[PDB]
Amino acid sequence: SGFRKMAFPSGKVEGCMVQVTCGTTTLNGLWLDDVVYCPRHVICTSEDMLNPNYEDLLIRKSNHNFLVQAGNVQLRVIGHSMQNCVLKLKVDTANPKTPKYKFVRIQPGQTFSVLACYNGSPSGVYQCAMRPNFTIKGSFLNGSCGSVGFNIDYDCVSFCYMHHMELPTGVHAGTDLEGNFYGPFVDRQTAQAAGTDTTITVNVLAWLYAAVINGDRWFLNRFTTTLNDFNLVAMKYNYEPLTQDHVDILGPLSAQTGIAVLDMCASLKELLQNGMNGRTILGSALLEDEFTPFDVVRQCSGVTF
Amino acid sequence: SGFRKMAFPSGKVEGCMVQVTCGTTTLNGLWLDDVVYCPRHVICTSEDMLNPNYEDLLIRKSNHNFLVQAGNVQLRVIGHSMQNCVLKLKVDTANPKTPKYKFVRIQPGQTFSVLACYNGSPSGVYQCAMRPNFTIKGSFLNGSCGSVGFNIDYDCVSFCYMHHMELPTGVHAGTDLEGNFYGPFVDRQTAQAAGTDTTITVNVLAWLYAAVINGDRWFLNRFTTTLNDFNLVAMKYNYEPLTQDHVDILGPLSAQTGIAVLDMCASLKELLQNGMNGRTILGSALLEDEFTPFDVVRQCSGVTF
Ligand SMILES: CC(C)(C)NC(=O)[C@@H](c1cccnc1)N(C(=O)c1ccco1)c1ccc(C(C)(C)C)cc1
Numbered sequence A, B: 001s002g003f004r005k006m007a008f009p010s011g012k013v014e015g016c017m018v019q020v021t022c023g024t025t026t027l028n029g030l031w032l033d034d035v036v037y038c039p040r041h042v043i044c045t046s047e048d049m050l051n052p053n054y055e056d057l058l059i060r061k062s063n064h065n066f067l068v069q070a071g072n073v074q075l076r077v078i079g080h081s082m083q084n085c086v087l088k089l090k091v092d093t094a095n096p097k098t099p100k101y102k103f104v105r106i107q108p109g110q111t112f113s114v115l116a117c118y119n120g121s122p123s124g125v126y127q128c129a130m131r132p133n134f135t136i137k138g139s140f141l142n143g144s145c146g147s148v149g150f151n152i153d154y155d156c157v158s159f160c161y162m163h164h165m166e167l168p169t170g171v172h173a174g175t176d177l178e179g180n181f182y183g184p185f186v187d188r189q190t191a192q193a194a195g196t197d198t199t200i201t202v203n204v205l206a207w208l209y210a211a212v213i214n215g216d217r218w219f220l221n222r223f224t225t226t227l228n229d230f231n232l233v234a235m236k237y238n239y240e241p242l243t244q245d246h247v248d249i250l251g252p253l254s255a256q257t258g259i260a261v262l263d264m265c266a267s268l269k270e271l272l273q274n275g276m277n278g279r280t281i282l283g284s285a286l287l288e289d290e291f292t293p294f295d296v297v298r299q300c301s302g303v304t305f
């Protein structure tokens, strides 16, 4: 029993973390096969980051300008190119610790583990979700750029995030491993703001099914509701609209707990309208939305990797 | 910027996780050098766990009754002994992935990372604290016994916990790597209850210093208080008494933020007496106490391993 915010084992990712320096700027890179992936803004200078022209800046850089370090071993960069907002440095040696991996672009509301790194060395791992406004509420300090977020499927690592920027509000922005930013953000020092950060409703529901599975049932009320009526209250509290797919995604937890999805929606509705009256659910005083239906199943079943 | 509940990279611990079976009971073991550590209750049967006499039960077991599996490779048990509530199976091969390690018994209020495992395979990692009642609020399912909690010091792993039991309330109990239970709990199926779970006050203070460092300052009031007066309110809300050592431990955060410790105590006092009025601190609606002063420094500075 018990429900903690939990991340994948990071061993497989640790073996791919290297350091990348260009000029005076140092950050983290991802070393898979004979290619190192890192954010392109490594080539910028503090003055050039107001309006960087990466095409022109990259022209002044040669292979020998990119300093890559795996542990204390230097890698020979024999090629460099730019794919969207990420650099690809080709090295002479393939990473012997390269695991089975894949590059996937996740959807807003999905989760992943982040291995925060500094100078190509891991410092910690935690769990994030892709907010509906395409930011993440990470824990990143300077130099954390180049750290990656990932999911694990038994033996295969699915990379989905690489950190780039911190937004003025304190949130964080980045791209997938193909260099495409999640959201409308760009790698420049300019006024950028994220939209409204709604609540991932389906994730909250899975969290409530998690609570019921762990003994917290005080919030289970006696009503039920309609998917349309529930939505009328969700979209007033800045909640994501629930779809039939969400109801289907939640089916497994509905069958395990024996509580129809629409009944839990009614419980959630009364929680939103009346608050929690100072009580707690799974040790939290807020409605957590950073657990997907799959994460709940994984943690309440025991899926190992 | 940003503050998430974060754990150490688990790669070094992953390479020590093996599976241990005795009879029909399977659980996890820790493989360091040529010894495997696992809870002694692996030798119990479902009937014998009401009042297990481990001395007599262990007498009926030989080396070849303990089945240890590292990956899909079997290890030859050439010796077995009992140290407190943990078994030590001596194997013929030393663990090639054995890192620099140490066995430490942590103090209540301290934190550590847990690598939840099932059948000798890691499933996830999260951060825990040793509650003042000597339980932990883990996420453990059946078979999770034998998983370990640890801290990392650059390159040295300090093991401090090994999971044994789930208590009737839903909390969890275990021992250090020498087999000594944290708290007054015993490895039997009997009526056991933990005492009052107080709040680790010093950890809450470091969390508030963490918030101030991340931009959340709304709770900073205009008063100050005395260490004795603050305690009179803490011990009414079931908070740990603050000592001068706690004030000294918090010195670094007090100097960084420029807020004397006793002033933050006054802020905490008004939060306890009046609640948070539906606001949040670092994304939480409750006062978090599972971050030590050291964890806050590590996360707000960038200490890598
Ligand atoms: C908020 C801002 C002023 C832009 N500071 C940062 O983004 C920090 C940073 C700080 C904390 C977490 N992640 C990045 N930041 C860095 O820390 C950094 C840059 C290179 C290695 O580490 C950073 C990220 C992107 C840029 C440009 C404008 C060139 C794309 C410049 C600096």
Ligand SMILES: CC(C)(C)NC(=O)[C@@H](c1cccnc1)N(C(=O)c1ccco1)c1ccc(C(C)(C)C)cc1
Residues within 6 Å of the ligand: A001, B025, B026, B027, B041, B042, B044, B049, B050, B140, B141, B142, B143, B144, B145, B164, B165, B166, B167, B168, B187, B188, B189
């Ligand atoms: C609450 C209780 C009825 C005792 N169930 C468990 O403790 C589960 C268990 C379940 C969830 C998390 N950790 C342990 N539990 C186990 O899951 C387990 C035992 C062996 C391998 O996995 C367990 C722990 C200790 C004992 C004795 C009494 C022999 C010391 C028996 C079973």
